[PDB]
Scaffold this motif. Structure first.
Motif, PDB file in Angstrom:
ATOM      1  N   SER A   6      13.349 -76.505 -90.820  1.00 41.31           N
ATOM      2  CA  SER A   6      12.043 -76.799 -91.397  1.00 41.31           C
ATOM      3  C   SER A   6      11.023 -75.698 -91.121  1.00 41.31           C
ATOM      4  O   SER A   6      10.021 -75.604 -91.838  1.00 41.31           O
ATOM      5  CB  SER A   6      11.532 -78.152 -90.868  1.00 41.31           C
ATOM      6  N   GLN A   7      11.252 -74.852 -90.121  1.00 38.75           N
ATOM      7  CA  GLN A   7      10.358 -73.736 -89.850  1.00 38.75           C
ATOM      8  C   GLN A   7      10.839 -72.426 -90.469  1.00 38.75           C
ATOM      9  O   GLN A   7      10.221 -71.386 -90.239  1.00 38.75           O
ATOM     10  CB  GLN A   7      10.174 -73.557 -88.345  1.00 38.75           C
ATOM     11  N   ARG A   8      11.921 -72.451 -91.239  1.00 41.41           N
ATOM     12  CA  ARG A   8      12.581 -71.228 -91.673  1.00 41.41           C
ATOM     13  C   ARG A   8      12.122 -70.825 -93.066  1.00 41.41           C
ATOM     14  O   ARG A   8      11.897 -71.672 -93.938  1.00 41.41           O
ATOM     15  CB  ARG A   8      14.102 -71.389 -91.673  1.00 41.41           C
ATOM     16  N   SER A   9      12.012 -69.519 -93.273  1.00 35.74           N
ATOM     17  CA  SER A   9      11.799 -68.946 -94.595  1.00 35.74           C
ATOM     18  C   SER A   9      12.810 -67.828 -94.756  1.00 35.74           C
ATOM     19  O   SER A   9      12.691 -66.798 -94.101  1.00 35.74           O
ATOM     20  CB  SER A   9      10.385 -68.404 -94.758  1.00 35.74           C
ATOM     21  N   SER A  10      13.819 -68.049 -95.590  1.00 34.93           N
ATOM     22  CA  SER A  10      14.896 -67.098 -95.805  1.00 34.93           C
ATOM     23  C   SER A  10      14.947 -66.832 -97.300  1.00 34.93           C
ATOM     24  O   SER A  10      15.156 -67.759 -98.091  1.00 34.93           O
ATOM     25  CB  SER A  10      16.233 -67.640 -95.291  1.00 34.93           C
ATOM     26  N   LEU A  11      14.735 -65.577 -97.683  1.00 40.69           N
ATOM     27  CA  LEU A  11      14.427 -65.216 -99.062  1.00 40.69           C
ATOM     28  C   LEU A  11      15.582 -64.430 -99.662  1.00 40.69           C
ATOM     29  O   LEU A  11      16.095 -63.488 -99.040  1.00 40.69           O
ATOM     30  CB  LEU A  11      13.145 -64.396 -99.131  1.00 40.69           C
ATOM     31  N   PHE A  12      16.006 -64.823-100.855  1.00 44.14           N
ATOM     32  CA  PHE A  12      17.039 -64.074-101.543  1.00 44.14           C
ATOM     33  C   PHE A  12      16.582 -63.705-102.951  1.00 44.14           C
ATOM     34  O   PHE A  12      15.783 -64.410-103.582  1.00 44.14           O
ATOM     35  CB  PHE A  12      18.387 -64.827-101.568  1.00 44.14           C
ATOM     36  N   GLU A  13      17.096 -62.567-103.405  1.00 45.56           N
ATOM     37  CA  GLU A  13      16.899 -62.041-104.753  1.00 45.56           C
ATOM     38  C   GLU A  13      17.903 -62.726-105.669  1.00 45.56           C
ATOM     39  O   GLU A  13      19.095 -62.735-105.364  1.00 45.56           O
ATOM     40  CB  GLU A  13      17.098 -60.521-104.731  1.00 45.56           C
ATOM     41  N   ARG A  14      17.419 -63.363-106.744  1.00 45.35           N
ATOM     42  CA  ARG A  14      18.305 -64.092-107.647  1.00 45.35           C
ATOM     43  C   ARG A  14      19.342 -63.157-108.259  1.00 45.35           C
ATOM     44  O   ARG A  14      19.027 -62.033-108.670  1.00 45.35           O
ATOM     45  CB  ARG A  14      17.500 -64.775-108.761  1.00 45.35           C
ATOM     46  N   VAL A  15      20.586 -63.635-108.341  1.00 37.37           N
ATOM     47  CA  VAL A  15      21.655 -62.756-108.801  1.00 37.37           C
ATOM     48  C   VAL A  15      21.622 -62.530-110.310  1.00 37.37           C
ATOM     49  O   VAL A  15      22.004 -61.447-110.771  1.00 37.37           O
ATOM     50  CB  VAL A  15      23.028 -63.282-108.357  1.00 37.37           C
ATOM     51  N   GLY A  16      21.184 -63.526-111.090  1.00 35.90           N
ATOM     52  CA  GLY A  16      21.144 -63.458-112.538  1.00 35.90           C
ATOM     53  C   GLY A  16      20.535 -62.188-113.107  1.00 35.90           C
ATOM     54  O   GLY A  16      21.143 -61.515-113.943  1.00 35.90           O
ATOM     55  N   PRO A  17      19.312 -61.845-112.689  1.00 39.42           N
ATOM     56  CA  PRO A  17      18.696 -60.615-113.219  1.00 39.42           C
ATOM     57  C   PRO A  17      19.412 -59.339-112.797  1.00 39.42           C
ATOM     58  O   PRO A  17      19.355 -58.353-113.545  1.00 39.42           O
ATOM     59  CB  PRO A  17      17.264 -60.669-112.665  1.00 39.42           C
ATOM     60  N   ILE A  18      20.076 -59.314-111.632  1.00 43.19           N
ATOM     61  CA  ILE A  18      20.842 -58.131-111.233  1.00 43.19           C
ATOM     62  C   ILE A  18      22.017 -57.918-112.181  1.00 43.19           C
ATOM     63  O   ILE A  18      22.293 -56.792-112.624  1.00 43.19           O
ATOM     64  CB  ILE A  18      21.341 -58.263-109.775  1.00 43.19           C
ATOM     65  N   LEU A  19      22.761 -58.988-112.467  1.00 45.47           N
ATOM     66  CA  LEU A  19      23.872 -58.871-113.409  1.00 45.47           C
ATOM     67  C   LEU A  19      23.374 -58.411-114.771  1.00 45.47           C
ATOM     68  O   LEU A  19      24.018 -57.584-115.431  1.00 45.47           O
ATOM     69  CB  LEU A  19      24.611 -60.203-113.543  1.00 45.47           C
ATOM     70  N   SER A  20      22.212 -58.913-115.193  1.00 45.93           N
ATOM     71  CA  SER A  20      21.699 -58.567-116.515  1.00 45.93           C
ATOM     72  C   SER A  20      21.192 -57.132-116.563  1.00 45.93           C
ATOM     73  O   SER A  20      21.509 -56.393-117.493  1.00 45.93           O
ATOM     74  CB  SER A  20      20.600 -59.539-116.917  1.00 45.93           C
ATOM     75  N   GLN A  21      20.388 -56.730-115.577  1.00 48.17           N
ATOM     76  CA  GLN A  21      19.817 -55.391-115.594  1.00 48.17           C
ATOM     77  C   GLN A  21      20.903 -54.321-115.652  1.00 48.17           C
ATOM     78  O   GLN A  21      20.773 -53.348-116.397  1.00 48.17           O
ATOM     79  CB  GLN A  21      18.914 -55.167-114.374  1.00 48.17           C
ATOM     80  N   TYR A  22      21.985 -54.484-114.892  1.00 49.47           N
ATOM     81  CA  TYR A  22      22.992 -53.436-114.785  1.00 49.47           C
ATOM     82  C   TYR A  22      24.242 -53.723-115.603  1.00 49.47           C
ATOM     83  O   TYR A  22      25.211 -52.958-115.517  1.00 49.47           O
ATOM     84  CB  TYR A  22      23.372 -53.209-113.321  1.00 49.47           C
ATOM     85  N   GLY A  23      24.244 -54.797-116.390  1.00 44.49           N
ATOM     86  CA  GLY A  23      25.393 -55.146-117.206  1.00 44.49           C
ATOM     87  C   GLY A  23      26.655 -55.381-116.407  1.00 44.49           C
ATOM     88  O   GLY A  23      27.728 -54.882-116.760  1.00 44.49           O
ATOM     89  N   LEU A  24      26.547 -56.154-115.334  1.00 44.58           N
ATOM     90  CA  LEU A  24      27.662 -56.406-114.440  1.00 44.58           C
ATOM     91  C   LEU A  24      28.202 -57.815-114.641  1.00 44.58           C
ATOM     92  O   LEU A  24      27.476 -58.718-115.066  1.00 44.58           O
ATOM     93  CB  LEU A  24      27.240 -56.215-112.984  1.00 44.58           C
ATOM     94  N   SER A  25      29.484 -58.001-114.327  1.00 45.35           N
ATOM     95  CA  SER A  25      30.128 -59.297-114.463  1.00 45.35           C
ATOM     96  C   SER A  25      30.665 -59.738-113.120  1.00 45.35           C
ATOM     97  O   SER A  25      31.343 -58.972-112.428  1.00 45.35           O
ATOM     98  CB  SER A  25      31.259 -59.273-115.489  1.00 45.35           C
ATOM     99  N   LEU A  26      30.358 -60.976-112.771  1.00 46.11           N
ATOM    100  CA  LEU A  26      30.902 -61.582-111.572  1.00 46.11           C
ATOM    101  C   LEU A  26      32.416 -61.601-111.646  1.00 46.11           C
ATOM    102  O   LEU A  26      32.986 -61.970-112.678  1.00 46.11           O
ATOM    103  CB  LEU A  26      30.365 -63.005-111.464  1.00 46.11           C
ATOM    104  N   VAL A  27      33.074 -61.205-110.559  1.00 49.00           N
ATOM    105  CA  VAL A  27      34.488 -61.527-110.393  1.00 49.00           C
ATOM    106  C   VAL A  27      34.599 -62.976-109.937  1.00 49.00           C
ATOM    107  O   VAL A  27      33.970 -63.375-108.949  1.00 49.00           O
ATOM    108  CB  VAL A  27      35.158 -60.583-109.386  1.00 49.00           C
TER     109      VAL A  27
END
Ligand code: AES
Length: 199
Positions: free
Chosen positions: A176-197
């Motif tokens: 409840s005291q934690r703030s852990s921040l991640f960059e959404r993966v969707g826009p990374i795949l889109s920006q660089y034209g990458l496909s999840l394995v």
């Protein structure tokens, strides 16, 4: 070497981050991770051996990158659970606030919690990064770039930052005291034209 979400990699033989997700761009192998882990061209090693380099990056503003991986290496569409197993990655459907989520990285291993907010701005020392998703799974210095994912295997994003304490992590305080921040993966795949394995 095998590329797997959550495992340690070194940058310029100097610093450490954790693999986000195996990806492909056509025939080119690679993995997505955090942009703050390396400048463009930075040399990447996994398991005592050069595997590639930072192909592209945005940080700050965003916090994303992908590392192109030489063809001699194998990509695994999964994330390590830091107890000898893997969790299959099956897609990148985004989960809502309140949904359960886990992350994997080289410092704190495999840790779980919930998504608690979206579109957060982190005011890092290097500058603002906008649009981050917050969870309350814990993390520590070195987990950066590592996989965030639902237990059913939907990739959420890559580890960016959060409120580490003087021991370098936020695992010593309750979720409840934690703030852990991640960059959404969707826009990374889109920006660089990458496909999840997937698997
Ligand atoms: S990363 O997750 O390894 C990470 C998280 C938090 C910090 C604190 C500085 N913003 C550094 C690296």
């Amino acid at each position: 070497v095998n590329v797997l979400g959550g495992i340690e990699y070194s940058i310029n033989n100097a610093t450490l981050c954790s693999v986000g997700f195996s990806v492909t761009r056509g025939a080119t192998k690679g993995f997505v991770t955090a942009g703050h882990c390396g400048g463009v061209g930075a040399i990447v090693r996994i398991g005592g051996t050069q595997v590639g380099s930072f192909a592209a990056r945005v940080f700050p503003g965003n916090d994303r990158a992908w590392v192109s991986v030489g063809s001699a290496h194998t990509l695994q569409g999964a994330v390590s659970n830091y107890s000898g197993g893997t969790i299959a990655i099956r897609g990148s459907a985004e989960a809502a606030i309140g949904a359960a989520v886990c992350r994997s990285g080289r410092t704190t291993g495999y840790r779980c919690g919930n998504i608690t907010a979206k579109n957060v701005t982190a005011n890092y020392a290097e500058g603002a990064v906008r649009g981050l998703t917050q969870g309350n799974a814990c993390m520590g210095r070195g987990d950066s770039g590592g996989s965030w994912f639902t237990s059913a295997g939907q990739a959420q994003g890559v580890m960016s930052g959060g409120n580490v304490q003087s021991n370098g992590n936020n695992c010593g305080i309750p979720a409840s005291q934690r703030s852990s921040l991640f960059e959404r993966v969707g826009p990374i795949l889109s920006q660089y034209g990458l496909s999840l394995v997937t698997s």
